UniProtKB/Swiss-Prot annotation, chain A:
The 26S proteasome consists of a 20S proteasome core and two 19S regulatory subunits. The 20S proteasome core is a barrel-shaped complex made of 28 subunits that are arranged in four stacked rings. The two outer rings are each formed by seven alpha subunits, and the two inner rings are formed by seven beta subunits. The proteolytic activity is exerted by three beta-subunits PSMB5, PSMB6 and PSMB7. It is found in: Cytoplasm; Nucleus. GO terms for biological process: proteasome-mediated ubiquitin-dependent protein catabolic process. The keyword Heme does not apply. It comes from Rattus norvegicus (Rat). Non-catalytic component of the 20S core proteasome complex involved in the proteolytic degradation of most intracellular proteins. This complex plays numerous essential roles within the cell by associating with different regulatory particles. Associated with two 19S regulatory particles, forms the 26S proteasome and thus participates in the ATP-dependent degradation of ubiquitinated proteins. This is Proteasome subunit beta type-3. InterPro entries: Ntn_hydrolases_N, Proteasome_beta_3, Proteasome_bsu_CS, Proteasome_sua/b, Proteasome_suB-type. It comes from the Eukaryota. The lineage of its organism: Eukaryota, Metazoa, Chordata, Craniata, Vertebrata. Belongs to the peptidase T1B family.
From Swiss-Prot, chain B:
This is Proteasome subunit alpha type-6. The 26S proteasome consists of a 20S proteasome core and two 19S regulatory subunits. The 20S proteasome core is a barrel-shaped complex made of 28 subunits that are arranged in four stacked rings. The two outer rings are each formed by seven alpha subunits, and the two inner rings are formed by seven beta subunits. The proteolytic activity is exerted by three beta-subunits PSMB5, PSMB6 and PSMB7. Interacts with ALKBH4. PROSITE patterns: PROTEASOME_ALPHA_1 (PS00388), PROTEASOME_ALPHA_2 (PS51475). Belongs to the peptidase T1A family. It comes from Rattus norvegicus (Rat). The modification Phosphotyrosine is found at residue 159. NCBIfam families: PRK03996.1. Component of the 20S core proteasome complex involved in the proteolytic degradation of most intracellular proteins. This complex plays numerous essential roles within the cell by associating with different regulatory particles. Associated with two 19S regulatory particles, forms the 26S proteasome and thus participates in the ATP-dependent degradation of ubiquitinated proteins. Its main location: cytoplasm. GO terms for biological process: positive regulation of canonical NF-kappaB signal transduction; proteasome-mediated ubiquitin-dependent protein catabolic process; proteolysis involved in protein catabolic process. The modification Phosphoserine is found at residues 17, 63-64.
Curated annotation (Swiss-Prot), chain D:
Its main location: cytoplasm. The active site is at residue 1. The 26S proteasome consists of a 20S proteasome core and two 19S regulatory subunits. The 20S proteasome core is a barrel-shaped complex made of 28 subunits that are arranged in four stacked rings. The two outer rings are each formed by seven alpha subunits, and the two inner rings are formed by seven beta subunits. The proteolytic activity is exerted by three beta-subunits PSMB5, PSMB6 and PSMB7. It comes from Rattus norvegicus (Rat). Keywords: Cytoplasm, Hydrolase, Nucleus, Protease, Proteasome, Threonine protease, Zymogen. It is found in: Cytoplasm; Nucleus. This is Proteasome subunit beta type-7. Its EC number is 3.4.25.1. The keyword Cytoplasm applies. Component of the 20S core proteasome complex involved in the proteolytic degradation of most intracellular proteins. This complex plays numerous essential roles within the cell by associating with different regulatory particles. Associated with two 19S regulatory particles, forms the 26S proteasome and thus participates in the ATP-dependent degradation of ubiquitinated proteins. It comes from the Eukaryota. It catalyses: Cleavage of peptide bonds with very broad specificity.
From Swiss-Prot, chain H:
The modification N-acetylserine is found at residue 2. Gene3D superfamilies: Glutamine Phosphoribosylpyrophosphate, subunit 1, domain 1 (3.60.20.10). The 26S proteasome consists of a 20S proteasome core and two 19S regulatory subunits. The 20S proteasome core is a barrel-shaped complex made of 28 subunits that are arranged in four stacked rings. The two outer rings are each formed by seven alpha subunits, and the two inner rings are formed by seven beta subunits. The proteolytic activity is exerted by three beta-subunits PSMB5, PSMB6 and PSMB7. Interacts with AURKB. Interacts with CDKN1A. Interacts with MDM2 and RB1. Interacts with the C-terminus of TBXA2R isoform 2. Interacts with DNAJB2. The modification Phosphoserine is found at residue 243. This is Proteasome subunit alpha type-3. Component of the 20S core proteasome complex involved in the proteolytic degradation of most intracellular proteins. This complex plays numerous essential roles within the cell by associating with different regulatory particles. Associated with two 19S regulatory particles, forms the 26S proteasome and thus participates in the ATP-dependent degradation of ubiquitinated proteins. The gene is Psma3.
């Protein structure tokens, strides 16, 4: 899921965890180079309608390869009446980037999602075309990876409800936009229940 | 009628037929008998031995050159039984398959794996209408790298399975019957005994008893992985041994 | 090959329609009824599932109805082996068009692309056509709501209410009278759909396993494709029997 | 960068690794699997560049899957050694991967090192990455060419933790992957330290100084 | 990178091989065994850089692997030596180390061939190539006297390998020996710490 | 290859509404040895009887139950030659899916992919339509799967189905004894009953093979275990 | 399982040579390890584990103890969830019938097996147990009791007319019903027997007894 | 055979009830109709002899080539129809040509005979191409086996021969070879003798004249394969005519 460059006018993903919900927060940023004109266009996409995968950088191949991957995820989702596992999709994405051989164009995938029908928490980032990345901790990713990583450690509420994570996250996104050109350009925060997706769109330039 | 009736184009090329197999495929089994070779295969526990009739139809042949025993790899040896036209051709195909593993793997191919790659090959011929199935079968001996001496045979239609004892020939059903009683009564298997069972069974059904230059014995021993030809002096040795058994 | 095994599998007839294609229609007839009916706010497919026996794990959503895309669906009537090759490709083309274009796939577009592959087999190659006639249900932002049929040759015609399977001729005739080109809401449309399965299927008591109705409706500003539940299908059947008794005496 | 080691003991691998993949001392990944389970008797350790290392192992892994299933007899170490050498050299390689290839064939245990070029070689204990030297100094002396297996698990946990703590090529936690010859044993705690973040009192934004902005259903 | 010497005898042949492979500074591989096989009677040693050599060995080994089965008897040495050369003329910008081809053919049972990084295939009474052998490159020719005998040759291949290891920093000090005959290949590992290493300058 | 080749289809429809060769193929699967496959809903068991009739088969390898990969297994019906390609094919597919997903091929997905290749073989010339029926088992994603793949290409997902010798009787027993969502013990017991329905392939332990898929993967069962299940049926 | 090669083999020898008393302790232990059926490494051990339990009786003939040990076997039979279950129970039941440790004890053990077999599972398992239970009831001369249990077999099983165990249960019933001196019943039971007997899946022995 | 009106003898991807294709057998008659090629294995080399029929008196040697030089140590002597002989020649030349160039040593024959026979046979299998209605021999001098001679039939069967004849009087020629010891005899004497068998075969009341092509690969040429030198060629023919009478 290789995208041309990184210049997409914003590149940032943060994922942060609870035991009652898990959240993936994203720039909703679009429009390559410094000049934007828009602040809307899909980037995080529901693929089982309750798991997300985020593909990050320039708009065209980000949307294009996601959709072409969606079709292979779908095949597997379609046939059986139960939908695919997160761990098997996690290597699937790793391989998809790898197919684009040596001296490849850099994407940065972030997968956030609770596992389907074996219930445990999952957060992962891919980048380059790299070794397997299953973690159960926290993951922040992009080219300003260090800046995201800080925030992904920052939100975990192990015992508060879903709501407190959102309000904490709104401040977390904002402070990050003042620190880098990767956050911002409108922010979409996704709190993911297992049975559906809740999309909230945050106020913030 | 049957074995020569149109129902599609299945008495011509491979497609199923009223007989619940394939006519074209069945001629390929019938084809084995024509060649005139009969083989007995015994699996020992120190070697795996195949004895087959070696077709000698001139007196202007050199012994070394004229054989049906072929070296596929330095681990696997075989005998070809059936039509000789088909025999040379299958062996050359196998050889490319053995070699293909040989570079990648970095070691000698298992007897089971050699038989699996060739068996599948004989299936392409069988699946295709572009070519007719092989009139011959290749019966493999070799030291498997942990299971032990192993005898596998792939069909002329290409399916393979493992055997204690096998037979293919002019008389496929009868040799196999003679062979189960030899296994049942268990003399045990050393180098000499297992070779001895194998030759006698080939002699008793057809009711010949051979010269050493009209049977061929080929072994893969655990003396070395390399396949050898025993040659007439050692083949004669085994013939004399058959007397005053069991 | 051989020229004595050739009397030309692929050839043109002077009557203009290939021998193998007419022969394939009889095979379509044999498989169970698959219909599509239009609503003025959706489109739905109603089909009888190939399975009718007790034994069925129910790994597919329905063997006949394939959920291809988030705005397209198709059902098959005919040869199931033949169905698997067309439905898998179909799944890929319909999906690429909604996904990328952000513009919901037209049935008319879809059929022309698939029919090219079907057709190649009938004109040349020494081959033979597909055993299925497929009914596409979808919504596109162009014409609006649509229904399409494709045939073994790669011939299409766009209806708005059509039935294929056994007692096709009778069915379309019934359909002409009650439905023209748009008058039935989503609920009446669904009632009409159960009615056609009823006459044509032998069992007139039906079941949720026996038939499957999947609906496609755009609700709350996104186009929703859903397989209805066994409860929902059963509620529609229970509502339909009361009304069946009253309608025909 | 990375930290990978193997030791030669009674069964094929005792593997030690950090989870983290770092570019110098900055984390790209907090946890990953650097010593991999793809099969359960073929294990592979990784070092250097992440991308180069993953593809070289995966290609061998696919070829191993075929032998394993047909024979119903073990995977072949040699086949794996030869396959990464020819296949990655052909490609000419994006950077370097020090890879530790390992399977028990039919005979004894064989451990191999695919260097930074692309080669098929035979030692018996490998360490891979920029930390190959660092991982080695403990391994070479405590292991004296076969030792008690259980003693090896204590020793190795001790070595692995030493690589993590003294050498900045390893964040988060340390992972050990043990196979006797078809075992899959994973404990990711070969170092004592807190796994993620700690919030005894919960403030990460002052009590509703910001409020929830919109809720939508994307159907 | 490695230390390889292979000396041809009027008897048959003797090999001598490294114990370490070294990269840029750190030693990549701490226990060395080199027998890439093209056939069961003929072997090659991958000298100099491991990678460059190994890929040549590997393409050559696939054709010779095919060939030995095909002929029925195993291949001759000279067949393998032309094939090692065939790759190396093309990929001479990507390989320039040394390939050491030694064993038994079927046309005499007495052949040692050198395919070099500048290319040529010739037979020589002794050759040393690789890392530490280059140091002693003129020298290995110098140390023997032509057509020496099997016992004397055995002490010389051991003694010259020690003297080369001492000389370059690409070898260690353990002499791994291989005696090649009609029999097969038999290999012996003669320890080091106990025997005397060649004199060292003040 | 070194020839012109074929490309004409060997099947032409009928004004019946049938394809002629697949109906001849269906007769060959029935002529096989009994193979049953049941998804219990607590694991999948595939059991077969193999006509060796001499027990001079030193198979510790290939059988009529052969694992495709570590949580897929395959059992066939009919003739052996057609099996040989399908078993190799399946292993290749298992490998293709292993590279990207690295969880070996799922059952719903496998069938579609085999089905497409089987359909070509009918549709094209220089190849012919099989006359083997495969029963595919798998446990992946915390659900057992049982599918049956017909010699045409068609795939149906079953709870319990039969093939091989006297399948008509088998499917009818299967409905009566087995009902949907019964236990792993029932699935195994009826499975062995169908083989016993009519045997006649030498009654020794190495003449029946079962391979079971469950939560921990797929392994084929030792012939001695298989015999114990049989022993109960009179 | 964790040791039906170690512990079980020793127990078998102790049962032949000396008395079951020593063996009571061992019997508990082995059955408890066996409870885990296994489906991925069950292997050779499981096939032996189940076989030895069946073979256990009549290595010292009738005892009070022979009756007693058996109760431990009852939790194992149920738990395993395999086809091989049918075989063990039937065996273990037939042997206690032969070597009576008391009629009372033998009736309790078959009654409990049956109650459990009726709940879910299969028609095949229930039938082996009932032949043991009606026969116990016939000999004791409680003809009335046999009639009750017997009736359960007639109503449900009819559907199947291919069942080999079922001929044996019903002929023991016809005979009991003759003794009871209710003649309609005697014919009724025979009717059920013959319908199922006609099937070609039933041995020459079973076909013979019908007659 | 059969003369069925659809297939079996009209195709060759179809086997008879017994398992044989009639099409290869019809082709097998073709070697019998024209002149013989004899070839005997020595141990210092191989000596080949093909009688080329003077059909027209306005031909010169090199016309209707029955003798090919496969490499510079491999020969091919054919008998039967010359068009199928040419194809077989072309494949053989390329197979021999790659082996000397690449390996650097002389080709062991037994593999080569098997490969070429594989080629013949692969075409038999197919119904889209024909069985080859030529019988041909390959002969070589090697440093791994010494001299080898193999004869491959129109069926694709390979056997090694001490001494072969394929042609219009196999029975008369083979027998003459049996009587003589040429099996391990020196190539020089053999030249005369191979020609003398050709003289018996030939009739002056079924043929007018023939032009002898023999080929050396033996001790005169030092193992190099050349078509017979004009002086030697003549000497050997001269003996053939003189000795009968």
């Amino acid at each position: 899921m290789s995208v041309m460059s990184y210049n997409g006018g914003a590149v940032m993903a943060m994922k942060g965890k609870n035991c009652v919900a898990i959240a993936a927060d994203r720039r909703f940023g679009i429009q390559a180079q410094m000049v934007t004109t828009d602040f809307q266009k899909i980037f995080p996409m529901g693929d089982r309608l309750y798991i997300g995968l985020a593909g990050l950088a320039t708009d065209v191949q980000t949307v294009a390869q996601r959709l072409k991957f969606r079709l292979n995820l779908y095949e597997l989702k379609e046939g059986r009446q139960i939908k695919p596992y997160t761990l098997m999709s996690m290597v699937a994405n790793l391989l998809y980037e790898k197919r684009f051989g040596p001296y490849y164009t850099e994407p940065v995938i972030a997968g956030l999602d609770p596992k389907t029908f074996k219930p445990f928490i999952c957060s992962l980032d891919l980048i380059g075309c790299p070794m397997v990345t299953d973690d159960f901790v926290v993951s922040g990713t992009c080219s300003e990876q260090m800046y995201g990583m800080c925030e992904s450690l920052w939100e975990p509420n192990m015992d508060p409800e879903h709501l407190f994570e959102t309000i904490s996250q709104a401040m977390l996104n904002a402070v990050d936009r003042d620190a880098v050109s990767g956050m911002g350009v409108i922010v979409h925060i996704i709190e993911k229940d297992k049975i559906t997706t809740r999309t909230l769109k945050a106020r913030m330039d | 009628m049957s074995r020569g009736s149109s129902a599609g184009f299945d008495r011509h090329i491979t497609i199923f037929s009223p007989e619940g197999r394939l006519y074209q495929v069945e001629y390929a089994f019938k084809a084995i008998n024509q060649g005139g070779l009969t083989s007995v295969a015994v699996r020992g526990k120190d070697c795996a031995v195949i004895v087959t009739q070696k077709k000698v139809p001139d007196k202007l042949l050199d012994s070394s050159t004229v054989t049906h025993l072929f070296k596929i790899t330095e681990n696997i040896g075989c005998v070809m039984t059936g039509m000789t036209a088909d025999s040379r051709s299958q062996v050359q195909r196998a050889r490319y398959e053995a070699a293909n593993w040989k570079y990648k793997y970095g070691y000698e191919i298992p007897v089971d794996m050699l038989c699996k790659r060739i068996a599948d090959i004989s299936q392409v011929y069988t699946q295709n209408a572009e070519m007719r199935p092989l009139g011959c079968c290749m019966i493999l001996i070799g030291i498997d790298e942990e299971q032990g001496p192993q005898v596998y045979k792939c069909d002329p239609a290409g399916y393979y399975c493992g055997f204690k004892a096998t037979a293919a020939g002019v008389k496929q059903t009868e040799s196999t019957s003679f062979l189960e009683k030899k296994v049942k009564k268990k003399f045990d298997w050393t180098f000499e005994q297992t070779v001895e069972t194998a030759i006698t069974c080939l002699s008793t059904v057809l009711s010949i008893d051979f010269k050493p230059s009209e049977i061929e014995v080929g072994v893969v021993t655990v003396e070395n992985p390399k396949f050898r030809i025993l040659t007439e002096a050692e083949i004669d040795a085994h013939l004399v041994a058959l007397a005053e058994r069991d | 090959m051989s020229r004595r095994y050739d009397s030309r599998t692929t050839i043109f007839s002077p009557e203009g329609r290939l021998y193998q294609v007419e022969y394939a229609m009889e095979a379509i007839g044999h498989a169970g009824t698959c219909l599509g009916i239009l609503a003025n706010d959706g489109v739905l497919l109603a089909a009888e599932r190939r399975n009718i026996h007790k034994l069925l794990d129910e790994v597919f959503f329905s063997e006949k109805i394939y959920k291809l895309n988030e705005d397209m669906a198709c059902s098959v009537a005919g040869i199931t082996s033949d169905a698997n090759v067309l439905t898998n490709e179909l799944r890929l083309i319909a999906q690429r068009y909604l996904l990328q274009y952000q513009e919901p796939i037209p049935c008319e577009q879809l059929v022309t692309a698939l029919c090219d592959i079907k057709q190649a087999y009938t004109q040349f190659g020494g081959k033979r056509p597909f055993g299925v006639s497929l009914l596409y249900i979808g919504w596109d932002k162009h014409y609006g709501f649509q229904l399409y049929q494709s045939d073994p040759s790669g011939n299409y015609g766009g209806w708005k209410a059509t039935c294929i399977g056994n007692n096709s001729a009778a069915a379309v005739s019934m359909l002409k009278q009650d439905y023209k080109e748009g008058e039935m809401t989503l609920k009446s449309a669904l009632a009409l759909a159960v009615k056609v399965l009823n006459k044509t299927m032998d069992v007139s008591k039906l079941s949720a396993e026996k038939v499957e109705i999947a609906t496609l409706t755009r609700e709350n500003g996104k186009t929703v494709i859903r397989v209805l539940k066994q409860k929902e299908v059963e509620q529609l059947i229970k509502k339909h029997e009361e009304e069946e008794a009253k309608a025909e005496r | 960068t990375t930290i990978a080691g193997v030791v030669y003991k009674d069964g094929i691998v005792l593997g030690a690794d950090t989870r983290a993949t770092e570019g110098m001392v900055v984390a790209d990944k907090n946890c990953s699997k650097i010593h991999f389970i793809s099969p359960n008797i073929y294990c592979c350790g990784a070092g250097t560049a992440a991308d180069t290392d993953m593809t070289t192992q995966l290609i061998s892994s696919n070829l191993e899957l075929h032998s394993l299933t047909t024979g119903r007899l073990p995977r072949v170490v040699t086949a794996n050694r030869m396959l990464k050498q020819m296949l990655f050299r052909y490609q000419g390689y994006i950077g370097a991967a020090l890879v530790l290839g390992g399977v028990d064939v039919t005979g004894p245990h064989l451990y191999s090192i695919y260097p930074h070029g692309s080669t098929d070689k035979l030692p018996y204990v490998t360490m891979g990455s920029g930390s190959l030297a660092a991982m080695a100094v403990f391994e070479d002396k405590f292991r004296p060419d076969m030792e008690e297996e259980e003693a090896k698990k204590l020793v190795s946990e001790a070595i692995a933790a030493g690589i993590f703590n003294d050498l900045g090529s390893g964040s988060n936690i340390d992972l050990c992957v043990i196979s006797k010859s078809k075992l899959d044993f994973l404990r990711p705690y070969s170092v004592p330290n807190k796994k993620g973040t700690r919030f005894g009192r919960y403030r990460c934004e002052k009590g509703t100084t910001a409020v929830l902005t919109e809720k939508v259903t994307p159907l | 990178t490695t230390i390889m010497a292979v000396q041809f005898d009027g008897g048959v042949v003797l090999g001598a091989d490294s114990r370490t492979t070294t990269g840029s500074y750190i030693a990549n591989r701490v226990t060395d065994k080199l027998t890439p096989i093209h056939d069961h009677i003929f072997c090659c040693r991958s000298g100099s850089a491991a990678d460059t050599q190994a890929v040549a060995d590997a393409v050559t080994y696939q054709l010779g692997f095919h060939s030995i089965e095909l002929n029925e008897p195993p291949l001759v040495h000279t067949a393998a030596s032309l094939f090692k050369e065939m790759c190396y003329r093309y990929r001479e910008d990507l390989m320039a180390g040394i390939i050491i081809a030694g064993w038994d053919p079927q046309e005499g049972g007495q052949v040692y061939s050198v395919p070099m990084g500048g290319m040529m295939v010739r037979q020589s009474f002794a050759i040393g190539g690789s890392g530490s052998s280059y140091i002693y490159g003129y020298v290995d020719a110098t140390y023997r006297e032509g057509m020496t005998k099997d016992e004397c040759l055995q002490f010389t291949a051991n003694a010259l390998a020690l003297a080369m290891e001492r000389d370059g920093s690409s070898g260690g000090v353990i002499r791994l020996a291989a005696i090649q005959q009609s029999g097969v290949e038999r290999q012996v590992l003669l320890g080091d710490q106990i025997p005397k290493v060649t004199i060292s300058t003040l | 290859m070194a020839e012109r080749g074929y490309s004409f289809s060997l099947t032409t429809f009928s004004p019946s509404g049938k394809l002629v060769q697949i109906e001849y193929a269906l007769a060959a699967v029935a002529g096989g040895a009994p193979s049953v496959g049941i998804k219990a809903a607590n694991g999948v068991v595939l059991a077969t009887e193999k006509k060796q009739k001499s027990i001079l088969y030193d198979e510790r390898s290939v059988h009529k139950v052969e694992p495709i990969t570590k949580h897929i297994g395959l059992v066939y019906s009919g003739m052996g030659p057609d099996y040989r390609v399908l078993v190799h094919r399946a292993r290749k597919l298992a490998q293709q899916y292993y590279l990207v997903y690295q969880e070996p091929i799922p059952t719903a997905q496998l069938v579609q992919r085999v089905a497409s290749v089987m359909q070509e073989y009918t549709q094209s010339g220089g190849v012919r339509p099989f006359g083997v029926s495969l029963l595919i088992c798998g446990w992946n994603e915390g659900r057992p799967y049982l599918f049956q793949s017909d010699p045409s290409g068609a795939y149906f997902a079953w709870k319990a189905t039969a093939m091989g010798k006297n399948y008509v009787n088998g499917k009818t027993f299967l409905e009566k004894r087995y009902n949907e969502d019964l236990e792993l013990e029932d699935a195994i017991h009826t499975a062995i009953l169908t083989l016993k329905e009519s045997f006649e392939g030498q009654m020794t332990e190495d003449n029946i093979e079962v391979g079971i898929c469950n939560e921990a993967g797929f392994r084929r069962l030792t012939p001695t275990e298989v015999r114990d299940y049989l022993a109960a049926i009179a | 399982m964790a040791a039906a090669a170690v512990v079980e083999f020793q127990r078998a020898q102790s049962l032949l040579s000396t008395d079951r008393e020593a063996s009571i302790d061992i019997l508990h232990s082995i059955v408890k390890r066996d409870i885990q059926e296994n489906d991925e490494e069950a292997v050779q051990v499981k096939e032996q584990s189940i076989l030895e339990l069946g073979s256990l009786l009549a290595k010292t003939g009738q005892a009070a103890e022979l009756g007693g040990l058996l109760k431990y076997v009852r939790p194992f039979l149920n738990s395993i969830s395999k086809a091989k279950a049918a075989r063990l129970v039937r065996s273990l039941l037939d042997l206690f019938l032969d070597m009576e440790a008391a009629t009372g004890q033998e009736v309790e053990l078959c009654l409990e097996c049956i109650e459990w077999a009726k709940s879910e599972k299969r028609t095949f398992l229930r039938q082996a147990l009932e032949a043991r239970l009606v026969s116990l009831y016939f000999d004791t001369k409680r003809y009335q009791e046999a009639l009750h249990l017997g009736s359960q077999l007639l109503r449900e099983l009819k559907k199947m007319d291919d069942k080999a165990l079922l001929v044996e249960v019903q002929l023991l019933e016809s005979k009991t019903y003759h003794a009871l001196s209710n003649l309609p019943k005697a014919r009724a039971a025979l009717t059920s027997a013959r319908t199922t007997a006609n099937a070609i899946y039933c041995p020459p022995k079973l076909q013979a007894t019908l007659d | 055979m059969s003369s069925i009106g659809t297939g079996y003898d009209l195709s060759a991807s179809t086997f008879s009830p017994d398992g044989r294709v009639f099409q290869v057998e019809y082709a097998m008659k073709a070697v019998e109709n024209s002149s013989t090629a004899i070839g005997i294995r020595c141990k210092d080399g191989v000596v080949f002899g093909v009688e080329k029929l003077v059909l027209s008196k306005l031909y010169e040697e090199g016309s209707n080539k029955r003798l090919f030089n496969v490499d510079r140590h491999v020969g091919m002597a054919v008998a039967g129809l010359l068009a199928d002989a040419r194809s077989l020649a072309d494949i053989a030349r390329e197979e021999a040509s790659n082996f000397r160039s690449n390996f650097g040593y002389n080709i062991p024959l037994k593999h080569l005979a098997d490969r070429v026979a594989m080629y013949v046979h692969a075409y038999t299998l197919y119904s889209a191409v024909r069985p080859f209605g030529c019988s041909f021999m390959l002969g070589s001098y090697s440093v791994n086996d010494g001299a080898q001679l193999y004869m491959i039939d129109p069926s694709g069967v390979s056997y090694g021969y001490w001494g072969c004849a394929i042609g219009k009087a196999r029975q008369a020629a083979k027998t003459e070879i049996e009587k003589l010891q040429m099996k391990e005899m020196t190539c020089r004497d053999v030249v005369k003798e191979v020609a003398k068998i050709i003289y018996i075969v030939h009739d002056e009341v079924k043929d007018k004249a023939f032009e002898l092509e023999l080929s050396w690969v033996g001790e005169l040429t030092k193992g190099r394969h050349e078509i017979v030198p004009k002086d030697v060629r003549e000497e050997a023919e001269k003996y053939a005519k003189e000795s009968l009478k």
